[PDB]
Design a protein around this motif. Structure first.
Motif, PDB file in Angstrom:
ATOM      1  N   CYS A  83      81.797  51.826  25.711  1.00 46.30           N
ATOM      2  CA  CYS A  83      82.480  50.914  24.802  1.00 46.30           C
ATOM      3  C   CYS A  83      83.521  50.066  25.524  1.00 46.30           C
ATOM      4  CB  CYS A  83      83.121  51.705  23.663  1.00 46.30           C
ATOM      5  SG  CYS A  83      83.950  50.696  22.419  1.00 46.30           S
ATOM      6  N   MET A  84      84.363  50.678  26.365  1.00 43.50           N
ATOM      7  CA  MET A  84      85.313  49.834  27.084  1.00 43.50           C
ATOM      8  C   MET A  84      84.809  49.417  28.459  1.00 43.50           C
ATOM      9  SD  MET A  84      86.642  52.014  29.578  1.00 43.50           S
ATOM     10  CE  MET A  84      88.314  51.684  30.125  1.00 43.50           C
ATOM     11  N   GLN A  85      83.532  49.661  28.772  1.00 42.58           N
ATOM     12  CA  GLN A  85      82.959  49.095  29.995  1.00 42.58           C
ATOM     13  C   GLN A  85      82.643  47.564  29.871  1.00 42.58           C
ATOM     14  OE1 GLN A  85      80.520  52.148  32.438  1.00 42.58           O
ATOM     15  NE2 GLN A  85      79.096  50.426  32.244  1.00 42.58           N
ATOM     16  N   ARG A  86      82.946  46.986  28.697  1.00 43.97           N
ATOM     17  CA  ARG A  86      82.659  45.592  28.346  1.00 43.97           C
ATOM     18  C   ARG A  86      81.164  45.304  28.465  1.00 43.97           C
ATOM     19  NH1 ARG A  86      87.698  42.770  28.758  1.00 43.97           N
ATOM     20  NH2 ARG A  86      86.522  41.136  27.669  1.00 43.97           N
ATOM     21  N   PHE A  87      80.382  46.044  27.676  1.00 47.58           N
ATOM     22  CA  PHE A  87      78.935  45.927  27.648  1.00 47.58           C
ATOM     23  C   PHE A  87      78.393  45.578  26.270  1.00 47.58           C
ATOM     24  CE2 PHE A  87      76.429  47.636  31.388  1.00 47.58           C
ATOM     25  CZ  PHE A  87      77.442  47.432  32.307  1.00 47.58           C
ATOM     26  N   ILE A  88      79.184  45.751  25.211  1.00 51.09           N
ATOM     27  CA  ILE A  88      78.738  45.591  23.831  1.00 51.09           C
ATOM     28  C   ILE A  88      79.539  44.466  23.193  1.00 51.09           C
ATOM     29  CG2 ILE A  88      78.204  46.785  21.677  1.00 51.09           C
ATOM     30  CD1 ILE A  88      78.815  49.413  23.305  1.00 51.09           C
ATOM     31  N   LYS A  89      78.845  43.549  22.523  1.00 46.93           N
ATOM     32  CA  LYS A  89      79.469  42.392  21.895  1.00 46.93           C
ATOM     33  C   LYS A  89      79.191  42.417  20.397  1.00 46.93           C
ATOM     34  CE  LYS A  89      79.339  38.570  24.328  1.00 46.93           C
ATOM     35  NZ  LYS A  89      78.761  37.338  24.921  1.00 46.93           N
ATOM     36  N   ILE A  90      80.235  42.207  19.596  1.00 48.02           N
ATOM     37  CA  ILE A  90      80.182  42.358  18.144  1.00 48.02           C
ATOM     38  C   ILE A  90      80.420  40.984  17.531  1.00 48.02           C
ATOM     39  CG2 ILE A  90      81.174  43.491  16.132  1.00 48.02           C
ATOM     40  CD1 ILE A  90      79.721  45.385  18.000  1.00 48.02           C
ATOM     41  N   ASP A  91      79.356  40.389  16.972  1.00 49.72           N
ATOM     42  CA  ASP A  91      79.362  39.054  16.346  1.00 49.72           C
ATOM     43  C   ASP A  91      79.904  37.978  17.290  1.00 49.72           C
ATOM     44  OD1 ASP A  91      78.224  39.935  13.917  1.00 49.72           O
ATOM     45  OD2 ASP A  91      80.202  40.334  13.049  1.00 49.72           O
ATOM     46  N   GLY A  92      79.523  38.067  18.562  1.00 54.73           N
ATOM     47  CA  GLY A  92      80.020  37.141  19.558  1.00 54.73           C
ATOM     48  C   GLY A  92      81.361  37.494  20.166  1.00 54.73           C
ATOM     49  N   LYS A  93      81.981  38.598  19.751  1.00 47.55           N
ATOM     50  CA  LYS A  93      83.267  39.028  20.282  1.00 47.55           C
ATOM     51  C   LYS A  93      83.136  40.446  20.815  1.00 47.55           C
ATOM     52  CE  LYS A  93      84.027  37.037  16.808  1.00 47.55           C
ATOM     53  NZ  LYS A  93      83.239  36.042  16.034  1.00 47.55           N
ATOM     54  N   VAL A  94      83.682  40.688  22.000  1.00 49.11           N
ATOM     55  CA  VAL A  94      83.623  42.017  22.600  1.00 49.11           C
ATOM     56  C   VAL A  94      84.661  42.911  21.927  1.00 49.11           C
ATOM     57  CG1 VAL A  94      85.100  41.219  24.522  1.00 49.11           C
ATOM     58  CG2 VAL A  94      83.726  43.316  24.779  1.00 49.11           C
ATOM     59  N   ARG A  95      84.258  44.137  21.594  1.00 53.72           N
ATOM     60  CA  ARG A  95      85.125  45.099  20.927  1.00 53.72           C
ATOM     61  C   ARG A  95      85.241  46.348  21.788  1.00 53.72           C
ATOM     62  NH1 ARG A  95      88.499  42.423  17.654  1.00 53.72           N
ATOM     63  NH2 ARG A  95      87.259  41.015  16.343  1.00 53.72           N
ATOM     64  N   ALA A  96      86.459  46.881  21.898  1.00 54.50           N
ATOM     65  CA  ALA A  96      86.722  48.066  22.707  1.00 54.50           C
ATOM     66  C   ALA A  96      87.189  49.247  21.864  1.00 54.50           C
ATOM     67  CB  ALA A  96      87.749  47.753  23.796  1.00 54.50           C
ATOM     68  N   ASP A  97      86.794  49.302  20.595  1.00 52.24           N
ATOM     69  CA  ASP A  97      87.143  50.400  19.703  1.00 52.24           C
ATOM     70  C   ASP A  97      85.876  51.178  19.374  1.00 52.24           C
ATOM     71  OD1 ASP A  97      88.876  52.011  18.359  1.00 52.24           O
ATOM     72  OD2 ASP A  97      89.228  50.648  16.675  1.00 52.24           O
ATOM     73  N   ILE A  98      85.908  52.492  19.613  1.00 51.11           N
ATOM     74  CA  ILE A  98      84.722  53.318  19.431  1.00 51.11           C
ATOM     75  C   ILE A  98      84.428  53.588  17.962  1.00 51.11           C
ATOM     76  CG2 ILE A  98      84.963  54.364  21.691  1.00 51.11           C
ATOM     77  CD1 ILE A  98      86.182  56.825  20.241  1.00 51.11           C
ATOM     78  N   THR A  99      85.410  53.414  17.082  1.00 51.30           N
ATOM     79  CA  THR A  99      85.246  53.643  15.651  1.00 51.30           C
ATOM     80  C   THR A  99      85.377  52.341  14.865  1.00 51.30           C
ATOM     81  OG1 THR A  99      87.584  54.203  15.383  1.00 51.30           O
ATOM     82  CG2 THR A  99      86.053  56.006  15.857  1.00 51.30           C
ATOM     83  N   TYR A 100      84.806  51.266  15.394  1.00 49.24           N
ATOM     84  CA  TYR A 100      84.850  49.984  14.704  1.00 49.24           C
ATOM     85  C   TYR A 100      83.867  49.986  13.538  1.00 49.24           C
ATOM     86  CZ  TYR A 100      85.413  44.964  14.056  1.00 49.24           C
ATOM     87  OH  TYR A 100      85.697  43.721  13.540  1.00 49.24           O
ATOM     88  N   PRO A 101      84.271  49.520  12.352  1.00 48.89           N
ATOM     89  CA  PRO A 101      83.373  49.526  11.187  1.00 48.89           C
ATOM     90  C   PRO A 101      82.309  48.444  11.286  1.00 48.89           C
ATOM     91  CG  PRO A 101      85.515  48.617  10.598  1.00 48.89           C
ATOM     92  CD  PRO A 101      85.642  49.107  12.005  1.00 48.89           C
ATOM     93  N   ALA A 102      81.051  48.867  11.373  1.00 52.84           N
ATOM     94  CA  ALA A 102      79.905  47.967  11.351  1.00 52.84           C
ATOM     95  C   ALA A 102      79.170  48.139  10.030  1.00 52.84           C
ATOM     96  CB  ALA A 102      78.961  48.237  12.525  1.00 52.84           C
TER      97      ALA A 102
END
Lengths: 262, 206, 151
Positions: free
Chosen positions: A64-83
């Motif tokens: 998650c904080m390796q900057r590998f996952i992008k959420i709606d065009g924005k990178v997120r570093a929270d493991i419990t982000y509500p999707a």
RNA sequence: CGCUACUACCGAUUGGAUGGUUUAGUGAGGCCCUCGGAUCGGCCCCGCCGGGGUGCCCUGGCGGAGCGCUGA
RNA sequence: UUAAAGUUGCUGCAGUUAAAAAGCUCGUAGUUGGAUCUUGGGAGCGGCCGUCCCCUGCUCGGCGCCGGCCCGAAGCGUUUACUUUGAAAAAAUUAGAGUGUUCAAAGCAGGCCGCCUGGAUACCGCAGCUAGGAAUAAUGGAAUAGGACCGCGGUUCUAUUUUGUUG
RNA sequence: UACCUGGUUGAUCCUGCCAGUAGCAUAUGCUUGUCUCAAAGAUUAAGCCAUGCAUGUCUAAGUACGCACGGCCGGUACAGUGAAACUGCGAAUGGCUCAUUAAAUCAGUUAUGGUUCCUUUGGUCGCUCGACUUGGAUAACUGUGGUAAUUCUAGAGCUAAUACAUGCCGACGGGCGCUGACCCCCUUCGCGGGGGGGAUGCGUGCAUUUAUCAGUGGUGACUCUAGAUAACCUCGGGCCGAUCGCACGCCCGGCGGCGACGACCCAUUCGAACGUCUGCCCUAUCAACUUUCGAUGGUAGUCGCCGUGCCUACCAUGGUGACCACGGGUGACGGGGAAUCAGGGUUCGAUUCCGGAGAGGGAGCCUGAGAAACGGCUACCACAUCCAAGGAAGGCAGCAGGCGCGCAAAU
């Protein structure tokens, strides 16, 4: 309780989080965000149970904080982000994108999509507001405040937003004869066409939705997501196209698959 | 330790209720402001949500309204004469919402000569000595005099308001809570308000 | 008939001291009346339109809104001023003995002076409001006469 | 009626004790208001200089503060 | 402590003699209350009948045409209980579907040689919200005609589309 | 598995109870080879505790002149790691218990059109017309001390901020309204009237408050949002950035990319809180209860985040009750649930998930968004520790453990 809760028990989790019992006492309580607690899905739950990329709670944090996952065009570093509903998630390196659509049952489903469909996102407008210097405002179901909308966007419509600019490209009007699906309740994931819309003054305005094969059901006004204009859907539907097979046809299909597989 | 609960007291049927939990912190009460007059003192108290409420303890001036032609000016508080709630609260100089006070008549008068160009106040036997208003009367053109003449074609008000204007004080009402926002706003009393509250004052003082 | 107590009674929406050109007759001394449609299919009566009473808790000419539940009851007593008590008779069921019992729960609702043609036994309907008193939560929307009283 | 045992009951001792409501009076501590001003800062005069500017201001202090103002 | 207890009896106990009808009567609250209101018909199938359709009124419009017809709809239609459907009704637990934890209590896993899955469903007393019928039980329409209906006759407040531009 | 058997008599048929029969969960007794799960000081004592532990925390981005270590050509500033300490955040979550509480809690169903909301998410952040970086105090540190004693501390010498404060330039040349010197065109001779330019002076937007007018978007319905006018704008004072790091730079000193932090307002998320309808065990040897010591309602206010006798001043005598109010008891936390069960029922639910209450028991409060917090503070009583006798220090119904109480419960 003198303040807000910060823990969440495993058996107190919603059923669509789709967990087990004899693993741990606690469950991942998501951080506050655009979506509610009982209607969202944490990133750790998806990455650890659905995609099977990670096995523990530390591997999810590293990814998650390796900057590998992008959420709606924005990178997120929270493991419990509500999707939640139609949250476009993208992996830039292996070139995969997933669209979160409720399947024929009451849960989420993995659904790989092309990147050209991953550039936009259908979302539902909630209420219309007027700003300070006479600016009309839109409040979207994932809390996206959009300035200066189209004048023909009403209370229960659906707009399509490009994820790179945040503006409105095209919209669907709330009317009978449009493809619709339900988000919450006993019905979930069924794709149908709006026919009737009963108005009750001072209470919930129920509607009537007919399936493409002959089934009909009634849901509330808040349990409505308009996804198409007519019969053609604007997004790629999952497998089965949301038909809600009953237990007899499900048993027959499973028996046929077992007999054909051998 | 002043509480604001609804469980210290009897029920609808008249039977006593037994309290089960003690006094909470959202259930709070505070002592009264007792907003007096004098040089201005205002205290701040932190309330729920981190906000601040201005406790006006003493004050001098107020921003009143005079609605016959819609003008508002800053006006000094002079004296309180009537309170509809308590008859002791006139003996102690206290300010509350919907209270009855007297305010000075100078800025509304200056606005009246500076807008309508008719004399207000200035009782007979003593005319305009310091020679300022007729300076403004002169050096005008014909269009501007026509505009003033069409404006002062209708320049009538209530006679009780005029008598208050020779008396130098206008009977005023407060429409703001001084213990919550810290100011004393409101509007001057006019029309049936004047005769009703003048009847109340003449009945009480008799 | 009006202005009974130690303060002036007014409706804080309108301005009652507008300056006319003349301040004489032929157009003055008819004050405007504030009213609104309460909704839910209910119709405002003429007594709230052309009346002269002043209230702050009236559902038509007042600062109270109607939302929540719509109930009904029978008027029992008219003793305390500007508010009445109604009686709701309902049936309760027991699973063990498959037989009903009637129960009553009387409670106080608010009667504006718009409905002054009310006697004991008249059926009324009420709507839920914000708490107007210690035990008063409901406002009467309409009144219906009982049997008889043909006079 | 005679004998043994037991159970509660009435009862002098206006016996002993543990909890509660309460007449009247006292009431620590905190909170709010009115006062209270121990103590700590800053600007103008006396004393020394190095002045560009063309005997006068910018630059640094203590003793009396002149208990003058003002803030905590 | 539950069943056996039909020895607590609403389903479902007893009151002449085994335990138990107040000495008798009136009477308020409670409980229970007679008859009576639309029957019968038609287009047809299987050959008179068990399944099919028909016997509340009015201001705007789309499925079609030549100011004239049908369909729909902004908006109203005597109210209750009862009955059927629909929404929502946390999970675990109770039934219950799948699955060789070596069986079972378990658990939500797993099977083919990167691929295919499951992780359902029912129940959730009552009360609140809704949509087809009014048989069952209780209220009300007019008897001092202040009863319906029809077209007429008098008393008032307000709407821009107009008495050549404008006041 | 919808079930019976023995006992009153010389013997018979019955009402009726006693005793057998089965499960369940507490204890106790006798006994015990393997393996897989699993309750466990709740009943009597919400009685008392020695001792140890349970809440702390650093990234490429707040403050680093401890050589505590270490790189150099040292001489225009730091290679870098850094305990300590300032600042900011969290301790209000989690854990244990059932004492209080019988329309109170709680359960289903509604509403905030009657209010606050840490953090995250999205918007706003040159809309206002009026410095190429300012000030002095304290830490850590050095040195010097008192008390028998504590996570106790005073005077002395320096020093930092994303700590405490004071605050500008640009945008910024002209727009929008009042006051307006004045100027210009004309049938009407001027006079009278109609129509255009206006220097100067004042106010300007968002956040608060009062008063007036009209009716972009919405609801079943606003004293709703937006618009206009006239002002207010608290010295305990609303915002409009005097903050930090990485990669490099184009164009003649100006000018750029991605972030971190902070901020008035607006919606959202987590919620909390007050209300609406219905539903709780026994008791008449409790039949009337409340009522200027607010009981019921009206007017106007105070306070509270908001409605409201929540509380004040004045009015009327109201409100509940045989359909069980009120009063008492409870070996009563409430619910999801457990046992037995043909069909109906009866009993239990201290106990792992939800909501509520308390930390000896009442009372009061600072900080903070959120506490009447007790591993926060302040006084009372019960109980209790150390002492040079002057004083100082605390609340295991947290995890282990000990005493008491016990039929009854572990490292």
């Amino acid at each position: 309780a003198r303040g807000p809760k910060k823990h969440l028990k495993r058996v107190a989790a919603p059923k669509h989080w789709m967990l087990d019992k004899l693993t741990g006492v606690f469950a991942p309580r998501p951080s506050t965000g655009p979506h509610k607690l009982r209607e969202c899905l944490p990133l750790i739950i998806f990455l650890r149970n659905k995609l099977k990329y990670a096995l523990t709670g530390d591997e999810v944090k590293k990814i998650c904080m390796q900057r590998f996952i992008k959420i709606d065009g924005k990178v997120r570093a929270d493991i419990t982000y509500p999707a939640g509903f139609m949250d476009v998630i993208s992996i830039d390196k292996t070139g995969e994108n997933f669209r979160l659509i409720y399947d024929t049952k009451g849960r989420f489903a993995v659904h790989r999509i092309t990147p050209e469909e991953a550039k936009y996102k259908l979302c539902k407008v909630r209420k219309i507001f007027v700003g300070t210097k006479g600016i009309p405002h839109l409040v979207t179901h994932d809390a996206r405040t959009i300035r200066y909308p189209d004048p023909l966007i009403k209370m229960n419509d659906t707009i399509q937003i490009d994820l790179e600019t945040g503006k409105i490209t095209d919209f669907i009007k709330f009317d009978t004869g449009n493809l619709c699906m339900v988000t919450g309740g006993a019905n979930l994931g069924r794709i149908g066409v709006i026919t009737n819309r009963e108005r009750h003054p001072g209470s919930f305005d129920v509607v009537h939705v007919k399936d493409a094969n002959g089934n009909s059901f009634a849901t509330r006004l808040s349990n409505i997501f308009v996804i198409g204009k007519g019969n053609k859907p604007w997004i790629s539907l999952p497998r089965g196209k949301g038909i809600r097979l009953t237990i007899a046809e499900e048993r027959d299909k499973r028996l046929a698959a077992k007999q054909s597989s051998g | 330790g002043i509480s604001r609960d609804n469980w210290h007291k009897r029920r609808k049927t008249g039977g006593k209720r037994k309290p089960y939990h003690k006094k909470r912190k959202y259930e709070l009460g505070r002592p009264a402001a007792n907003t007096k007059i004098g040089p201005r003192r205002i205290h701040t108290v932190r309330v729920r949500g981190g906000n601040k409420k201005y406790r006006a303890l003493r004050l001098d001036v107020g921003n009143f309204s005079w609605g016959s032609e819609c003008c508002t000016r800053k006006t000094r508080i002079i004296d309180v004469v009537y309170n509809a709630s308590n008859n002791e609260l006139v003996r102690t100089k206290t300010l509350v919402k919907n209270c009855i006070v007297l305010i000075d008549s100078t800025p509304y008068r200056q606005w009246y000569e500076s807008h309508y160009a008719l004399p207000l106040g200035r009782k007979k036997g003593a005319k305009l000595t310091p020679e300022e208003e007729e300076i403004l009367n002169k050096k005008r053109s014909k269009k501007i005099q026509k505009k003033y003449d069409e404006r002062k074609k209708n320049a009538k008000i209530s006679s009780l308001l005029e008598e208050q204007f020779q008396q130098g004080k206008l009977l005023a009402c407060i429409a703001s809570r001084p213990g919550q926002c810290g100011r004393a706003d409101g509007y001057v009393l006019e029309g049936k308000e004047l005769e009703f509250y003048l009847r109340k004052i003449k009945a009480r003082k008799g | 008939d009006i202005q009974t107590e130690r303060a002036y009674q007014k409706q804080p929406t309108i301005f009652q001291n507008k300056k006319r050109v003349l301040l004489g007759e032929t157009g003055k001394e008819k004050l405007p009346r504030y009213y609104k449609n309460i909704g839910l299919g209910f119709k405002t009566p003429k007594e709230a339109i052309e009346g002269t009473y002043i209230d702050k808790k009236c559902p038509f000419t007042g600062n109270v809104s109607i939302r929540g539940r719509i109930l009904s009851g029978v008027v029992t007593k008219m003793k305390m001023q500007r508010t009445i008590v109604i009686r709701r008779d309902y049936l309760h069921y027991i699973r063990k003995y498959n037989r009903f019992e009637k129960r009553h729960k009387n409670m106080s609702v608010h009667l504006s002076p718009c409905f002054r043609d009310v006697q004991i036994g008249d059926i009324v309907t009420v709507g839920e409001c914000r708490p107007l008193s210690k035990t008063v939560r409901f406002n009467v929307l309409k009144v219906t006469k009982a049997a008889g009283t043909k006079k």
